């Protein structure tokens, strides 16, 4: 018997399953899927659509839960496509002539309902590729009876051919010779060349399945066509249909003469095409792929320094030009020698052309010159140097007044606001920025907001302030600005969303002198309006870098500054291109992989503090990757404000880590199961480790999941401890409890045990709080209902579910039933209860099963996580997740 009713749109599950006590596991998993956007709520029934079905089958977090419903096995099938007529004919039609077994090639006939097959009293499943091919053919058939014609046939069979190539389907004679390609994304092939007097760069657009002769026709035509017809050398014909989003990129590539990049405008397009094109280009050209193409082609935009060499008579002998490479990997510098004024004159002419074009690209003898930070003062200094050479030859913080009277800054928050203000009062001359590296949950947002509002009230006539953060954090920034301050004298503009369109230039209204540079994306003058704080995203910063860098700012805030950890990233280049009086880098983890992250952050905040990247690498990266760390920490100390939750443990509730839970003991059945598992894994390896570690984690947490025998059901020490302490909490304080576990089956087991022993089912939440208001609002409503319920309560969250904009301050007890391999995730999950605004002591439970003769997986995990957290207390230390190599002690016994 199948638990689902098959329909044309997916598998359907009745809502009455929640009312069946014998099907508790299935009902709980259906609730989990509904919470995780896998199920659609219909009239008294859940819907598991075919796309959701395939995504679920590919999901590994629900792999153990799949046997609950029992989806039919995928039947290996290869389709054979037939057709009649040609694309020109309005009666053109493509249908799947037959299906055959992939190895056997035997024709098969089925009875099909949606994606579920029926061969002979046995239901099967269509492959995702075969289902997509069938969907494409049926969509072409449905579209032809509506709008028959050439375009419909071409688009429909382009989709069909893509699906059939993905599904390895066989075409007939005509469809094999016919080719219709509709590019969705574009690839830019960059290769340095020396066509001109100096080096140039060649751009070559590339499709996923570009025809062999498409580029020739693309070059020959004076305009980019919506459609291309390219004869093939094999007697075939190829059609290319260019969507408008791809067409704008192809227009920009085609406007470059000969597809050779020479000059400031073309090199600026190569540096960052998204400012010239817009946000639509990111969907056409992947920014990471563009960065990789720039790296592979050795296209680095160097920073240059002109060092005049002085003679004994204070006269210039020669000028040395040092080009500092920009890349994630430090590279040796490039040094030139100007022994005569005319060489420096040519260099100055190149710089003048690049700055008169108002472009950040530059060029000099086959090397690019990042001119984003090349201010007008540097240009005047270079001109003065050239002229000179030619002539010679020939603290109490200030709280904002608009802060609400019921809001009090903490002592550390007041210290941070005072530190920010004192650093800002010398921001033009002495400092240039700072790194606010406090841990999460210390109210860094409120400190920065207080600093910004104090600046706005104190100096109302200064340029506006820029906040760059992910949208999920931009919403939080606006929310907290409204919550903490009287937002009457602080106008705000949020560039993300349709507000970018409200201030964007019309496509044809861009000024002609800027359209000649290939600039298709621009913001209308006065786009700032009366706003004093402007909220924008890193992606919007990259896309509107040209418009954002055209006016001076006062304070630029980069929240989660680890987004600019890569020196060569386009987002990092956009962030450094923006000219602000003070730049605050805000991240709780300044170093994630290497100290180059810290170098990038401080080059953004205080340029030149750590020197060039090669010097930093040879001085602080290579020696480290210690006294080097203690010197780096004292060099960055004056402009770094690093505070941890242990330093500010008094402006917080009391976090009690219970020790009684960590002394649990393996039962005899659990111990023998673990020993048998380890022995079997070792025997298999003698005749990988991640599977053994997962099995040991499941054995220690709930041995019944590993083995459904009755012995393992009644011999789970961690479950017994959980039930006992939940009873104690219920009968003692009536507090709310958060149980953290990522395993769906373990979540269902814990929910069932809590329901049996306490009469209510804890709500399981595994999804995040991203922009998914169709279900994010439901998850927030569940959280609020749990918090608002009086008295005792239990909720089963997951570490990945918690995050931004989610908190449970009505719960005091945090239980990590299964522990993650990254202490930062555990800390962020515990910081859902342990927070500012938690009025009761926080009891953190780490139930650990230990053995007197065996070092269990949980004991080793606890020790490793303690060591990793102790290391992570250091700001300059990276925090990688644990791996199978870190657990290479269980094999010892
Ligand atoms: N003085 C205060 N009074 C009341 N609540 C506060 C105060 N300061 C901070 N909070 C709250 O403390 C919560 C936790 O701080 P967070 O803002 O989440 O941490 P964070 O340092 O801002 O990290 P971010 O947001 O990624 S920069 C905030 O959501 C505020 O609601």
DSSP string covering 395-446 = ------TTB-TT----HHHHHHHHHHHHHHTTTTTT--EEEE-PPTTS-HHH
Which residue among 442, 445, 805 is best mutated to probe the pocket of ligand 1, counting the most ligand atoms within 8 A of its Cβ?
Answer: 445
- Determine the distance separating the centroid of ligand 1 and the alpha carbon of 493, expressed in angstroms: 22
Asked whether 738 and 814 are in contact (CB, 8 A), the reply is yes
Q: How many CA atoms lie within 13 A of 382 on its CB side?
A: 21
DSSP H or E run through 484: helix 471-484
Cα angle for residues 575, 577, 580 (degrees, 5° grid): 80
| Residue 733 Cα to ligand 1 middle (Å) | 27
The Å distance, Cα 471 to ligand 1 centre, comes to 17
Residue 408 alpha carbon to ligand 1 centre in Å: 12
Instruction: Give the residue, out of 414, 416, 439, 443, with the most ligand 1 atoms within 8 A of its beta carbon, to mutate for a pocket test.
Output: 443
Q: Which residues approach ligand 1 with their CB closer than 6 A?
A: 407-410, 413, 438, 440-446, 559, 586, 835-837
Burial of 268 by CB count in 10 Å (0-12 exposed, 13-18 middle, 19+ buried)? buried
Give the technique used to solve this structure. cryo-EM
Q: Which atom of ligand 1 is nearest to the CA of 409?
A: 1
Q: Which two tokens stand for residue 430?
A: 């002495």
Cα–Cα dist 738/793, whole Å: 9
- Please answer whether residues 777 and 835 qualify as being in contact, where contact means their C-beta atoms are separated by less than 8 angstroms: no
Residue burial 540-561, b: 16+ Cβ < 10 Å; e: rest: bbbbbbbbbbeeebbbbbbbbb
- Residue for token pair 């058939």: 141
Rounded distance between C-alpha atoms, residue 658 and residue 419, angstroms:
36
Q: How far is the C-alpha of 80 from the C-alpha of 160, rounded, in Å?
A: 12
Q: Which of 858, 862, 841 is nearest to 849 (CA)?
A: 858
State the burial class of residue 575 (Cβ atoms within 10 Å of its Cβ: 0-12, 13-18, 19+): buried
Resolution attained, angstroms: 2.8
Distance of CA 764 to the CA centre of its chain: 25
Residue to mutate, 471, 562, 836, 839, ligand 1, most ligand atoms under 8 Å from C-beta: 836
* Close Cβ partners of 687 (under 8 Å, ≥ 6 residues apart): none
Hey, which residues does 785 pair with through a beta bridge? none
Q: Are 96 and 779 in contact (CB under 8 A)?
A: no
Element (H, E) at 162: helix 150-167
- Both structure tokens of 180: 């219709």
- For 880, the 3-state DSSP assignment is coil
Closest CA to 560 of 519, 529, 601: 601
Measured in whole angstroms, the distance separating CA 96 from the mean position of its chain's CA atoms is 40
Q: Please check whether residue 545 is in contact with residue 275, taking contact to mean a CB–CB distance below 8 angstroms.
A: yes
Retrieve residue 536's tokens: 């924008």
The DSSP 8-state label assigned to residue 425 in this structure reads: T
Residue 477 CA: nearest ligand 1 atom is 25
Alpha helices in 579-667 (DSSP H): 596-605, 613-616, 627-635
Residues in the chain: 893
Residue whose C-alpha is closest to residue 341's, from 394, 285, 292: 394
Query: Considering only CA atoms, which of 563, 566, 513 is closest in space to residue 540?
Result: 563
Which atom of ligand 1 is the closest one to the Cα of 439?
21
What is the number of the ligand 1 atom nearest to the C-alpha of 836? 12
Query: Which single residue is written with the structure tokens 């349709």?
Result: 498
- Residue 454: which residues within 8 A CB-CB, separation 6 or more? 398, 399, 400, 417, 421
Of 163, 155, 206, the closest CA to residue 181 belongs to 155
Rounded distance from Cα 799 to ligand 1 centre (Å): 20
Residue 260 burial (CB < 10 Å; 0-12/13-18/19+)?
middle
Contact (Cβ atoms closer than 8 angstroms) between residue 133 and residue 96: yes
Contact 815, 798 (CB under 8 A): no
Asked if 465 and 452 count as a contact pair (C-beta separation under 8 A), the reply is: yes
Of all protein residues, whose CA lies closest to atom 14 belonging to ligand 1? Answer: 441
Instruction: Count CA atoms closer than 13 A to 438's CA, side-chain side.
Output: 24
Atom 25, ligand 1: which residue's CA is nearest?
445
CB atoms within 10 A of CB 8: 10
Residue holding tokens 């990254």?
A: 822
Q: Are 94 and 140 in contact (CB under 8 A)?
A: yes
Residue bearing tokens 């590994």: 60
Residue closest to 328 by CA, chosen among 563, 558, 594, 636? 594
Is the dihedral angle over the CA atoms 506, 508, 509, 512 positive or is it negative? positive
CA 871 to CA 851: how far, in whole Å? Answer: 27
Residue tagged 């908190």 (tokens): 807
Backbone angles phi, psi at 556, to 5 degrees: -110, 125
Distance 476 CA to ligand 1 centre (A): 10
Residue 66 has which token pair? 């799949």
Reading the block at residue 829, the tokens are 């999950």
DSSP symbol at 638: G
Counting ligand 1 atoms within 8 A of each CB, the residue from 446, 559, 833 with the most, and so the one to mutate, is 446
For the beta sheet containing 533-536, the strands, ordered from the edge strand earlier in sequence to the opposite edge, are: 492-494, 533-536, 465-468, 553-559, 580-586, 433-436, 640-641
The token pair at 461 is 């006539």
Element (H, E) at 282: helix 280-284
Give me the DSSP letters along 743-802.
-HHHHHHHHHHHHHHHSS-PEE-----SS-HHHHHHHHHHHHHHHHS-S-EEEEE-TTT-
**E strand map for 102-252:** 107-108, 116-118, 123-125, 178-181, 187-193, 200-206, 227-231, 237-241
**Ligand 1 centroid, distance to 470 Cα (angstroms):** 17
Closest Cα to residue 53, out of 128, 119, 130, 165? 128
| Cα–Cα distance for residue pair 150/830, rounded to 1 Å | 60
CB 72 within 8 A of CB 63: no
Q: Ligand 1, atom 26: nearest CA belongs to which residue?
A: 440
- Burial label for 476, CB within 10 Å (0-12, 13-18, 19+), is middle
Give bridge partners of residue 371 from the DSSP assignment: none
Residues 634 and 612: their CA atoms lie apart, in Å, by 18
Which residue in the block uniquely carries the two structure tokens 């799949």? 66
Q: Over the Cα atoms of the chain, what is R_g?
A: 32
Tally Cβ neighbours within 10 Å of residue 842. 21
Phi, psi of 836 (to 5 degrees): -75, 125
Distance in Å, CA 557 to ligand 1 centroid? 16
Closest CA to 462 of 373, 552, 548, 585: 552
CA–CA distance, 213 with 229 (Å, rounded to integer): 10
Ligand 1 centroid distance, CA of 446 (Å):
6
Separation CA 823–CA 831 (nearest Å)? 12
Whose CA is closest to 605, among 420, 427, 432, 416? Answer: 432
């Amino acid at each position: 018997k199948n638990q689902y009713q098959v329909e044309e749109n997916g598998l359907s599950f009745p809502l009455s399953l929640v009312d069946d006590s014998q099907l508790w596991a299935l009902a709980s998993w259906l609730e989990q899927l509904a919470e995780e956007d896998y199920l659609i709520s219909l009239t008294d029934r859940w819907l598991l659509s075919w796309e959701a079905l395939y995504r679920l089958l590919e999901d590994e977090e629900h792999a153990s839960s799949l046997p609950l419903i029992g989806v039919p096995d995928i039947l290996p099938l290869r389709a054979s496509l037939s057709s009649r007529g040609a694309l020109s004919d309005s009666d053109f039609r493509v249908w799947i002539a037959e299906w055959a077994t992939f190895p056997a090639r035997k024709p098969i006939r089925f009875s099909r309902t949606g994606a579920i097959l029926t061969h002979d009293n046995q239901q099967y499943l269509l492959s995702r590729e075969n289902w997509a091919l069938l969907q494409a053919t049926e969509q072409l058939s449905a579209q032809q009876i509506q709008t028959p014609g050439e375009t419909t046939n071409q688009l429909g069979w382009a989709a069909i051919r893509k699906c059939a190539k993905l599904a390895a389907a066989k075409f007939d004679d005509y469809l094999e010779k016919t080719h219709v390609i509709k590019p969705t994304s574009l690839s830019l092939r960059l290769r340095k060349a020396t066509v001109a007097d100096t080096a140039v760069i060649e751009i070559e657009p590339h499709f996923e399945d570009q025809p062999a002769n498409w580029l020739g026709s693309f070059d020959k035509n004076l305009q980019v066509h919506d459609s291309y017809r390219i004869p093939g050398e094999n007697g075939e014909l190829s059609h290319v249909i260019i969507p408008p989003e791809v067409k704008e990129v192809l227009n920009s590539i085609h406007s470059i003469p000969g597809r050779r990049v020479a000059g400031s405008e073309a090199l600026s397009f190569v540096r960052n095409p998204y400012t010239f094109l817009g946000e639509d280009a990111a969907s056409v050209i992947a920014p990471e792929e563009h960065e990789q193409a720039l790296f592979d082609a050795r296209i680095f935009f160097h920073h240059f320094r002109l060092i005049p060499q002085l003679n004994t008579e204070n006269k210039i002998t020669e000028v040395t030009l040092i080009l500092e490479p920009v890349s994630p990997v430090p590279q040796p510098e490039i040094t030139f020698v100007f022994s005569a004024p005319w060489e420096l004159d040519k260099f100055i002419q190149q710089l003048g052309i690049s700055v008169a074009a108002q472009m950040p690209a530059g060029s000099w003898q086959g090397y690019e010159l990042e001119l984003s930070q090349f201010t007008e003062q540097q240009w005047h200094d270079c001109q003065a140097l050239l002229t000179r050479w030619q002539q010679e030859i020939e603290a109490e913080p200030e709280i904002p007044l608009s802060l609400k009277e019921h809001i009090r800054l903490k002592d550390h928050q007041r210290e941070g606001v005072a530190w920010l203000q004192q650093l800002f009062l010398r921001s033009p001359e002495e400092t240039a920025g700072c790194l606010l590296a406090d841990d999460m949950g210390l109210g860094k947002t409120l400190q920065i907001l207080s600093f910004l509002v104090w600046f706005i009230e104190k100096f109302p006539q200064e340029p506006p302030n820029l906040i760059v953060a992910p949208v999920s954090l931009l919403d939080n920034w606006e929310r907290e600005l409204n919550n903490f301050f009287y937002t009457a004298g602080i106008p705000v503009l949020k560039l993300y969303g349709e507000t970018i369109k409200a201030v964007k230039y019309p496509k044809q209204a861009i000024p002609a002198h800027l359209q000649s540079k290939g600039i298709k994306n621009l913001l209308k003058p006065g786009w700032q309006g009366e706003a004093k704080i402007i909220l924008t995203t890193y992606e919007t910063l990259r896309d509107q870098e040209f418009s954002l860098a055209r006016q001076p700012w006062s304070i630029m805030v980069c929240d989660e500054a680890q987004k600019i950890k890569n020196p060569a990233a386009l987002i990092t280049h956009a962030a450094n291109a923006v000219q602000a009086r003070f730049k605050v880098a805000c991240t709780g983890t300044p170093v994630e992989n290497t100290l180059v992250d810290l170098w990038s952050l401080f080059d953004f905040a205080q340029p030149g503090l750590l020197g060039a990247l090669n010097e930093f690498g040879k001085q602080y990266v290579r020696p480290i990757e210690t006294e080097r760390l203690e010197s780096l920490r004292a060099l960055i100390e004056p402009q770094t404000l690093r505070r941890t939750k242990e330093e500010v443990a008094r402006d917080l509730p009391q976090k009690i880590e219970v020790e009684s839970c960590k002394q649990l003991t393996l039962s005899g059945v659990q111990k023998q199961l673990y020993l048998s598992s380890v022995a079997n894994w070792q025997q298999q390896q003698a005749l990988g480790m991640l599977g053994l570690l997962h099995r040991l984690k499941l054995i220690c947490a709930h041995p019944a999941i590993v083995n459904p025998e009755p012995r393992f059901r009644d011999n789970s020490p961690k479950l017994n401890w959980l039930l006992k302490i939940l009873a104690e909490i219920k009968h003692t304080s009536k507090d709310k409890v958060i149980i953290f576990t990522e395993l769906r089956d373990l979540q269902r087991e814990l929910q069932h045990a809590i329901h049996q022993n306490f009469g209510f089912r804890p709500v399981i939440i595994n999804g995040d709080s991203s922009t998914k208001s169709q279900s994010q609002n439901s998850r927030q409503r569940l959280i609020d209902d749990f918090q608002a319920q009086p008295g005792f309560g239990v909720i089963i969250l997951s570490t990945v579910a918690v995050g931004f904009g989610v908190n449970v301050q009505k719960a005091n007890h945090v239980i990590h039933f299964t522990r993650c391999w990254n202490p930062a995730k555990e800390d962020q999950a515990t910081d859902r209860a342990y927070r500012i605004g938690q009025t009761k002591n926080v009891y953190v439970y780490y139930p650990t099963v230990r053995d007197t003769e065996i070092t269990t997986f949980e004991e080793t995990l606890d020790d490793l996580l303690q060591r990793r957290r102790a290391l992570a207390r250091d700001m300059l230390c990276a925090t990688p997740d644990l791996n199978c190599a870190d657990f290479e002690t269980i094999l010892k016994g």
